[PDB]
């Protein structure tokens, strides 16, 4: 099984450096070119760069050339990405990937046949913060929910009635606000009937800040 | 005198690249020391005509690798095995194990050819996979008769995988044996297979001149 | 710098029906060895990209027969002969010829169904949230199709610009609909400094724009 495992992502501050690594199993790593491709939330793939099998040449995409460096330890089957001068825009999942073919340089083919699971990098100067959890109170079907507001970083998870109320739930993708903080809402439709008999509390988990909140609505 | 101690890597393994040879895949030396510990394979099987091939290599000066350029559509090319371990199931660094895209699917009839464009002879190697049973052969390549043919300017041979059980080695009772020819400049080898074929991905060109010895010093 | 231009960017397909995606290239991708250095990648929701087509027309390891790739020089095409549910995601073409490697914008393949109207609900700010400093008014659009939606925020029959962010779910794997959240943010100041609150929703499946209201 060819397997690429990225690690080293997390929250980092604008201007800092950070180093990602990619562990490779399944293949003579030392004979293959390796790439880094990144993807910013809700955006397309963007090539970061490539390293040749012996580390003699490297090439980088336009938006990171100058600030990122690629390198490899063939002795330990490990690819590395050194990011410097992190800007907010650099926020993305960083994927590691193998150059499938090993063709002569003059015909070098840069396809990538195997891709890792990716590692998340958040560049932000916000501080960790648990969310505030306000209700969305209903006016044959009614809709109630919770607004989960001003937390950082992602992710939060939400549930209803511990894990009982599952059907008809929708939890939305967070959005980033200008404050630097995230916010998201979660709603479930119920029979306006049950409204008064069965109780509905939402359970918000924000592990990154060790914050748990149960609001009744 | 630039000298190489193949240790656990057998001289022939430098051409097909079992894990134990990952560091000699393109060795260069004037003196080649082999060890009784050295091994040519990882999956059970042998090199046919292996002693003639051993003398070409001992006096080769090293090996230069060069992609052959074969590409494929409609099959899997990522066949791997517990017998060839790189932190997981792997294979021979210079060879591709071709098989049907899904269990029991019909492996397509295929014809691939390669022309030696360089100025010295090229070492071409390929493998016949003998499955442990008819049913495994069918699971991997689909049912029916299998046939590999290989031709060059003066040479023609067909090869018929004979599935059957051989003595359990490293838990496997199937076999992969390696056949080889020396392809003179401007000559062409032509493969024609419909399964049970272990295709070369890189060819080996001799580097120069060297003496080989299997000592214990 | 090879530019890659894909189209369409959004591709609703009825299950079992065919699908076609186009990729054009600012430079020829045909190398002197008769190969077109053009790849296709798929990214299924929440998964990494995976190889689909390499060198213009080759189905990579594992890729079923319903996919195929074609083209020459600068003009390339990915056909799926009979779309399956498991095939939704974002298709990327990518030139593999010259650094810097570049990608198409991505074509988002989604399941096509008959239109379905958005059951609209509106929510006023909480007392807890009001007791803070700001007010958040939330409009929900539940299980509609297609995803294109006109969500309009009414505060005493004035128009709002910059006061709302928005958020859609991913296509339901059961009913192929979406849901949408519009969240209007203003200060307790300007919240009280007005009275009636309503969100107007117009959808291909609604005969006439539907509004939901509440008064502070
Ligand atoms: C390509 C392929 O089929 N690989 C599989 C093979 C073959 O079926 C047989 O080994 C050949 O006889 O067998 C395994 O047991 C192994 O060797 O680890 C499982 C592995 O996935
Ligand atoms: C091989 O062919 C090329 C042209 O096709 C020619 O330049 C070269 O001399 C040939 N070499 C031999 C050994 O015939």
Residue numbers in the entry:
A (entry chain C): 1 to 139, 146 to 223
B (entry chain A): 46 to 262
C (entry chain D): 1 to 216
Quote from the publication.
H7N9 avian influenza virus is a zoonotic influenza virus of public health concern, with a 39% mortality rate in humans. We previously isolated a human monoclonal antibody (mAb) designated H7-235 that broadly reacts to diverse H7 viruses and neutralizes H7N9 viruses in vitro. MAb H7-235 exhibited a pan-H7 subtype binding pattern, hemagglutination inhibiting activity (HAI), and neutralizing activity. In summary, we determined the structural basis of molecular recognition for a broadly reactive (“pan-H7”) human antibody that mediates receptor blocking (in vitro HAI activity) without contacting the RBS directly by solving a cocrystal structure of rH-235 Fab/H7 HA1.
Here, we determined the crystal structure of the HA1 subunit of the surface HA protein of the avian H7N9 (SH13) influenza virus in complex with the Fab of antigenic site A-targeting mAb designated rH7-235 IgG. The asymmetric unit (ASU) contained 2 copies of the monomeric HA1 protein bound to 1 rH7-235 Fab each. The 2 copies of the complex in the structure were superimposable with a root mean square deviation (RMSD) of 0.701 Å for the Cα atoms. Analysis of data obtained from the crystal structure of the H7-235 Fab/HA1complex revealed that rH7-235 recognizes residues outside of RBS but near the edge of the RBS on the side of the H7 head domain. Close examination of the antigen-antibody interface determined using a 5 Å distance cutoff showed that the antibody binding site consists of 28 residues located on the membrane distal domain of HA between the HA protein 140 loop and 160 sheet. The rH7-235 Fab interacts with HA1 using contacts in both heavy and light chains. The Fab heavy chain complementarity determining region 3 (HCDR3) residue R110 (ImMunoGeneTics information system numbering) contacts three HA1 residues: A149, E150 and D255. The HCDR1 and heavy chain framework region 1 (HFR1) interact with the HA 140 loop: Fab residue G27 with HA1 residues R141 and S146 and Fab residue Q1 with HA1 residue S145. Antibody light chain framework region 3 (LFR3) residues Y55, R67, S69, G70, and V71 are encoded by the IGKV2-28*01 germline gene segment and contact HA1 residues Y127, S128, G129, T132, or N157, respectively. The crystal structure of the complex formed by the rH7-235 Fab with H7 HA1 shows that the antibody does not contact the RBS and it does not clash with the substrate glycan within RBS.
